[PDB]
Design a protein around this ligand. Structure first.
Ligand SMILES: [Mg+2]
Length: 175
């Protein structure tokens, strides 16, 4: 059993880890104590990056994120989201909430759907198993692109496994 906090710093990009530490501390969470979510924040940030034609909302400091979002909402005619999205697609002209889950994707998809009370915001969930689920079966990215995200997730998993971190990481996902 290795250290998740060690794993994370020598696994993800220094930029992803840096943005995830802010995201955590911004909510009185300490990345050194809650290492499992620390790793979940990095993996999700990383997927938002591989995914993005796109405007990255996630990772930005709250004030900047809402500034970017609002400016978007009135250059276009899109309704203001309530919760900040992760991305904005001006191709399909909609926001995107992205999720990486260790649980059943359909369950996670609904929790997100019920939270954002969406009308137009798109939802796309990825898991560590390869199963995915996107709004109206509209998967946005072509196959190869989505295949890369799934690869990076598997890679993250097994590197977590060799260090004995997977077992704890995989079953500590809360709603
Ligand atoms: Mg977000």
């Amino acid at each position: 059993l290795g250290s998740m906090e060690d794993f994370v710093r020598q696994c993800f990009n220094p930029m992803i880890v840096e943005l995830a530490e802010k995201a955590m501390k911004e909510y009185g969470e300490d990345p050194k104590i809650e290492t499992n979510k620390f790793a979940a924040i990095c993996t999700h940030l990383e997927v938002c990056f591989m995914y993005s034609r796109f405007e990255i909302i996630e990772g930005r400091d709250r004030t900047m994120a809402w500034t970017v979002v609002n400016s978007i909402c009135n250059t276009t005619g899109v309704e203001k989201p309530k919760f900040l999205p992760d991305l904005y697609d001006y191709k399909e002209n909609r926001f995107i909430e992205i999720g990486v889950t260790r649980r059943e994707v359909h369950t996670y998809y609904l929790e997100k759907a019920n939270k954002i009370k969406s009308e137009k915001t798109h939802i796309h969930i990825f898991s560590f198993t390869g199963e995915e689920m996107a709004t109206k079966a509209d998967y946005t990215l072509d196959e190869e692109s989505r295949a890369r995200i799934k690869t990076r997730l598997f890679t993250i998993r097994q590197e977590m496994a060799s260090r004995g971190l997977w077992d704890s990481f995989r079953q500590s996902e809360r709603g």
